[PDB]
Design an enzyme around this catalytic site. Structure first.
Site, PDB file in Angstrom:
ATOM      1  N   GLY A  13       0.827  -1.185   0.000  1.00  0.00           N
ATOM      2  CA  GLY A  13       0.000   0.000   0.000  1.00  0.00           C
ATOM      3  C   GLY A  13       0.867   1.243   0.000  1.00  0.00           C
ATOM      4  N   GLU A  14       0.256   2.333   0.424  1.00  0.00           N
ATOM      5  CA  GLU A  14       0.853   3.651   0.289  1.00  0.00           C
ATOM      6  C   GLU A  14       1.276   4.197   1.650  1.00  0.00           C
ATOM      7  OE1 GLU A  14       2.435   5.397  -1.578  1.00  0.00           O
ATOM      8  OE2 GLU A  14       2.336   7.101  -0.193  1.00  0.00           O
ATOM      9  N   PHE A  17       6.100   8.197   2.848  1.00  0.00           N
ATOM     10  CA  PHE A  17       7.144   8.694   1.959  1.00  0.00           C
ATOM     11  C   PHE A  17       7.095   8.079   0.560  1.00  0.00           C
ATOM     12  CE2 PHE A  17       9.566  11.238   4.892  1.00  0.00           C
ATOM     13  CZ  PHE A  17       9.373  10.663   6.128  1.00  0.00           C
ATOM     14  N   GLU A  19       5.725   4.163  -1.789  1.00  0.00           N
ATOM     15  CA  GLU A  19       5.035   2.883  -1.825  1.00  0.00           C
ATOM     16  C   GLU A  19       5.658   1.889  -0.850  1.00  0.00           C
ATOM     17  OE1 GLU A  19       1.967   3.567  -3.251  1.00  0.00           O
ATOM     18  OE2 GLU A  19       2.023   1.392  -3.453  1.00  0.00           O
ATOM     19  N   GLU A  76      10.676  -6.784   8.436  1.00  0.00           N
ATOM     20  CA  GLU A  76       9.937  -8.026   8.605  1.00  0.00           C
ATOM     21  C   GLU A  76       8.474  -7.825   8.223  1.00  0.00           C
ATOM     22  OE1 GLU A  76      10.544 -11.636  11.348  1.00  0.00           O
ATOM     23  OE2 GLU A  76      10.083  -9.938  12.652  1.00  0.00           O
ATOM     24  N   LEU A  77       7.905  -8.812   7.537  1.00  0.00           N
ATOM     25  CA  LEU A  77       6.508  -8.759   7.135  1.00  0.00           C
ATOM     26  C   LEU A  77       5.647  -9.579   8.081  1.00  0.00           C
ATOM     27  CD1 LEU A  77       4.353  -7.771   5.102  1.00  0.00           C
ATOM     28  CD2 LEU A  77       4.651 -10.028   3.956  1.00  0.00           C
ATOM     29  N   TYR A  78       4.584  -8.964   8.573  1.00  0.00           N
ATOM     30  CA  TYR A  78       3.599  -9.628   9.423  1.00  0.00           C
ATOM     31  C   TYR A  78       2.307  -9.817   8.628  1.00  0.00           C
ATOM     32  CZ  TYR A  78       7.199  -8.022  12.450  1.00  0.00           C
ATOM     33  OH  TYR A  78       8.445  -7.798  12.995  1.00  0.00           O
ATOM     34  N   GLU A  82      -2.831  -5.293  10.034  1.00  0.00           N
ATOM     35  CA  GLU A  82      -3.011  -4.314  11.100  1.00  0.00           C
ATOM     36  C   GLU A  82      -3.915  -4.867  12.203  1.00  0.00           C
ATOM     37  OE1 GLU A  82      -5.160  -1.348   8.925  1.00  0.00           O
ATOM     38  OE2 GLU A  82      -3.620  -0.984   7.419  1.00  0.00           O
ATOM     39  N   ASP A 122       2.197   7.823  16.803  1.00  0.00           N
ATOM     40  CA  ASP A 122       1.111   7.080  16.150  1.00  0.00           C
ATOM     41  C   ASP A 122       0.960   5.704  16.796  1.00  0.00           C
ATOM     42  OD1 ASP A 122       0.009   6.122  12.798  1.00  0.00           O
ATOM     43  OD2 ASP A 122      -1.090   6.874  14.533  1.00  0.00           O
ATOM     44  N   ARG A 126      -4.596   0.869  13.917  1.00  0.00           N
ATOM     45  CA  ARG A 126      -4.238   0.793  12.509  1.00  0.00           C
ATOM     46  C   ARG A 126      -2.723   0.754  12.315  1.00  0.00           C
ATOM     47  N   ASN A 127      -1.937   1.205  13.292  1.00  0.00           N
ATOM     48  CA  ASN A 127      -0.484   1.185  13.153  1.00  0.00           C
ATOM     49  C   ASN A 127       0.165   0.170  14.084  1.00  0.00           C
ATOM     50  OD1 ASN A 127       1.968   2.051  11.986  1.00  0.00           O
ATOM     51  ND2 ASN A 127       2.357   3.364  13.755  1.00  0.00           N
ATOM     52  N   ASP A 140       5.766   1.863  12.689  1.00  0.00           N
ATOM     53  CA  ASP A 140       6.670   2.992  12.478  1.00  0.00           C
ATOM     54  C   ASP A 140       6.176   4.282  13.128  1.00  0.00           C
ATOM     55  OD1 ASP A 140       8.852   1.989  10.937  1.00  0.00           O
ATOM     56  OD2 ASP A 140       7.403   1.583   9.332  1.00  0.00           O
TER      57      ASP A 140
END
Ligand SMILES: CN(c1ncccc1CNc1nc(Nc2ccc3c(c2)CC(=O)N3)ncc1C(F)(F)F)S(C)(=O)=O
Length: 245
Positions: A13-14, A17, A19, A76-78, A82, A122, A126-127, A140
């Site tokens: 997603g977006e 800073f 993609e 790392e990808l989870y 979210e 944040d 959602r984060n 982040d």
């Protein structure tokens, strides 16, 4: 870390800073699923947060695997995604115990960040990333309806204002992902807060936990608990809910 070791598979997603992509990273041949953040004063800032994340080494903060100085940040990808969306999907199976667990895990993250006067800005479902059903990770660095009064009025962000936002995040968790003040438009949030009105107690939230939340929503930043005290309190809330369960 060499770019040839990272294959991009799909847009995730977006980001702020640029993609964010998902892909795989392969020096022992292990295939590692990663999120690749990219970037289109903001380049240097992009790099600053990356270096910070590279130095953070905490079980409940998203893990940076490496940095490709088209600058890519390999995280790392989870795949669970979210926390907000995870909560809404599993609201019928999720127990109060686990929701207090998630809050405690983020509070341990914050407690570490507080010990170096590092304001996150944040802390929101959602984060927050779901690493596993029993492990969440703070995303982040950085939302009018999540912010303290002194941030809304004076654009001031301190560890105390992170504590307020943390309590907003707990409210979101105990509410299975509802948005704070979803019955209010942004403009009247500060008015509501100035009057002393707060978020109401979520149906599943134990009163002891809502009392803790109200202390974090003290209009006076000096009166709010520190994250070190909150960890002890929530640890205490968690052990109790576990015994009842
Ligand atoms: C999708 N985006 C995000 N939204 C919220 C939080 C985090 C991200 C992206 N960051 C990460 N995202 C993930 N995983 C992940 C997430 C969101 C979904 C999925 C996986 C599958 C899905 O459907 N949504 N794992 C690790 C990271 C990290 F932080 F370590 F870099 S975005 C708006 O494009 O930035």
């Amino acid at each position: 870390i060499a770019r040839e070791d990272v294959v991009l598979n799909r847009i995730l997603g977006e980001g702020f800073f640029g993609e964010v992509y998902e892909g795989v990273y392969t020096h022992k041949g292990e295939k590692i699923n990663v999120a690749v953040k990219t970037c289109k004063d903001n380049k240097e800032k992009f790099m600053s947060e990356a270096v910070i994340m590279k130095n953070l080494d905490h079980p409940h903060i998203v893990k940076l695997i490496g940095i490709i100085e088209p600058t890519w940040i390999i995280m790392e990808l989870y795949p669970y995604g979210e926390l907000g969306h995870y909560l809404e999907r599993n609201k019928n199976s999720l127990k109060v115990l686990t929701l207090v667990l998630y809050s405690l895990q983020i509070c341990k993250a914050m407690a570490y960040l507080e010990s170096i006067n590092c304001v996150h800005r944040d802390i929101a479902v959602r984060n927050i990333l779901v690493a596993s059903p029993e492990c969440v990770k703070l995303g982040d660095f950085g939302p009018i309806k999540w912010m303290s009064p002194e941030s809304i009025n004076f654009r001031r962000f301190t560890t105390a204002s992170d504590v307020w936002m943390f309590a907003v995040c707990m409210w979101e968790i105990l509410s299975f992902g509802k948005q704070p003040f979803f019955w209010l438009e942004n403009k009247d949030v500060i008015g509501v807060l100035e009057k002393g009105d707060r978020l109401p107690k979520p149906d599943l939230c134990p009163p002891v936990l809502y009392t803790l939340m109200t202390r974090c929503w003290d209009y006076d930043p000096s009166d709010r608990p520190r994250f070190t005290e909150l960890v002890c309190s929530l640890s205490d809330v968690y052990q109790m809910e576990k015994d009842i369960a």
